[PDB]
Amino acid sequence: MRSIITQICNGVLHGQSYQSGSNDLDKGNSEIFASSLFKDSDDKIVIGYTKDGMAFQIVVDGFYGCERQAVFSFIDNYVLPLIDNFSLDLTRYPDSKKVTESLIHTIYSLRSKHAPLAEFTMSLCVTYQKDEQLFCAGFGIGDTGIAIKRNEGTIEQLVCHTEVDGFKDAFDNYSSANIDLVIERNSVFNTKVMPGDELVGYTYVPPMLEMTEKEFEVEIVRHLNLDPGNFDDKDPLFSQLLQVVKSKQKQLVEQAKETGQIQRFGDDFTVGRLVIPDQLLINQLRIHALSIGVSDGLLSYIKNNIEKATLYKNLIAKYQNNHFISLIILSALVSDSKTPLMTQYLVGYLDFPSKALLANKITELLLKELENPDMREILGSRLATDVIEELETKIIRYIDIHSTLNLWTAD
C-alpha cells in the first residue's frame, strides 16, 4: 500500500542507449545509464527512497533473454516491499550480518515458490539512520558491483564482483542448496556515509578496467574492485566512468578489426548512480511518501463525501512538487471533523493505530522545514506557530487561493 521508487530501467532500452528521467523528487541525484556492449537489455536497475525516506539502489543482471520478465515482476511485486523491512532491521537490530543472510534466505525461499525459473545476479545497498550519522548496508552476489566516492576524492569500493574460479555465484537453483557457502565468498557490507558521497552501481565492464582485490579459497575465489588509478577526484564518478569505457570501446573494437571477421564478447552494460541525501531532503522525501499513499486508497472504495478528495487529489497533484504546501494541505484533512470517514479511513489504509500519532508526525516535519533556508526567506519574523493555524483555516474554504498560495511557492 505505497509508492516509493523514483527511477527504473525495465526490460527495455532505446537504440544503442537509454539514459534517465532525472526525477525532480531526487533534485538531480537519481541517474542511471544503459547500453549494449557487443540489441536488447536484460539487466534492471532500481533507485528509490523508503517511506521513512531512506535511500537505496538495486542492480540486477539476468541470464536468459527468454524469461526476462518474471525476473522483473519478481522484484516489483515481492522484493521491493522487503527494502523497508531491511532498513528498519538495520535501524532496530545492530548486527548487520544476521538480517542480511535472512533477507537472502527470504529471497531464496521466495524465489523458489514464486518464480524458480528466474536466474540473475543482484546487488543492492540501502541507507539507514540509527544515530545522528547515516549508515548504508547491503550485499551483492554475482557479476554485479557497487562503488562509492567520498567527499575527499576517494573511490572506495563497496560490494565487489565475486568470481568463483571462473564461476559466477548467482541466484540460481543450482546454488539454492549451497546457500551458506555463497555468503562467505560474496560481499556484504555496512559502512558509514556522509552527505554528498557518490554511490555508483554497475553491471558489466571490460576486464581491462577491473583490478583484483582479494583472492582466497574454500573447501579459488576472486574478489575484484574497479581500478581507481584512471579516475580523478574533481569530476563525479558516473560521468567519468562513461568517459573511459567508450574511450576503451573504440580501442577494443579497433582491436577487433585485425582478427579476420567478427569476434564475440560483451555483456549488457547498465549503470546506476545514487547520491546520499541530506537531512533536509529526507524530510521532504518523507513528505512525498505520505502524499502519494494518501490519495489512491479512498478512490476505489467509493468507486464501488467524495467530491472534496477528488479535488484534493488534483490539488496535491498541482502542488506536490513544492514540499511545504503539500504538507500543510494534509493538516487540514485531519482537522475536518465534518469529514470523519475520509479522515478515519486513511489511517486504516496506512495501518496507523491512532489518528493523533499521525497528527504529531505532521507538525514535526512541518517545523523542521522552517530550518530549510528557503522558508526563512519566505517566513520572516512572522510567528509561524500561528500562521500554520491560520493556514489551516485558509484551506477549509472548499468553494481563489492559488494566487494567495503562490506567495509561498515564489522560488
Residue numbers in the entry: 37 to 74, 88 to 268, 279 to 363, 383 to 477, 484 to 495
How did the manuscript describe this experimental structure?
While SidM catalyzes the attachment of adenosine monophosphate (AMP) to Rab1, SidD catalyzes AMP removal from Rab1, a process known as deAMPylation. Inactivation and removal of Rab1 is initiated upon translocation of the effector SidD which deAMPylates Rab1, thereby priming it for inactivation by the L. pneumophila GAP LepB and causing its gradual removal from the LCV 4–6 hours after bacterial uptake. SidD is a protein of 507 amino acids with no significant sequence homology to other entries in the database. Taken together, our data revealed that the CTD mediates localization of SidD to membranes using a dual-binding mode that combines a general membrane-binding determinant in form of the loopCTD with a specificity determinant represented by a helix-turn-helix unit at the C-terminus.
Crystals that diffracted to 3.6 Å were obtained with a slightly truncated variant comprised of residues 37–507 (SidD37-507). Residues 85–88, 269–276, 365–382 and 495–507 were not well-defined in the electron density map and could not be modeled. The six SidD37-507 molecules present in the asymmetric unit displayed identical structures with an L-like shape formed by two domains in nearly perpendicular orientation. The N-terminal deAMPylase domain possesses a protein phosphatase fold, while the CTD is formed by a bundle of anti-parallel alpha-helices with no apparent similarity to known structures. The two domains are connected via a flexible linker and are positioned almost perpendicular to each other in the crystal lattice. The ab initio molecular envelope calculated from the SAXS data revealed a similar L-shaped structure but with a maximum diameter Dmax of 115 Å, which differed from the calculated value of 89.2 Å for the crystal structure. Indeed, the SidD37-507 crystallographic structure exhibited a low fit with the observed solution scattering curve (χ2 = 2.48) supporting the hypothesis of interdomain flexibility. Our SAXS analyses subsequently revealed a relative mobility between the two domains, with 76% of the particles existing as L-shaped molecules in solution while the other 24% of the particles assumed a more extended morphology. Upon closer examination of the CTD sequence, we noticed a stretch of hydrophobic residues between helices α7 and α8 (370-FLGIYGFFT-378; loopCTD) that was unstructured in the crystal structure of SidD37-507, indicative of intrinsic flexibility, and that could constitute a potential membrane anchor for SidD. Having a high degree of flexibility between the catalytic domain and the localization domain could increase the sampling radius of membrane bound SidD from a two-dimensional plane to a three-dimensional space.
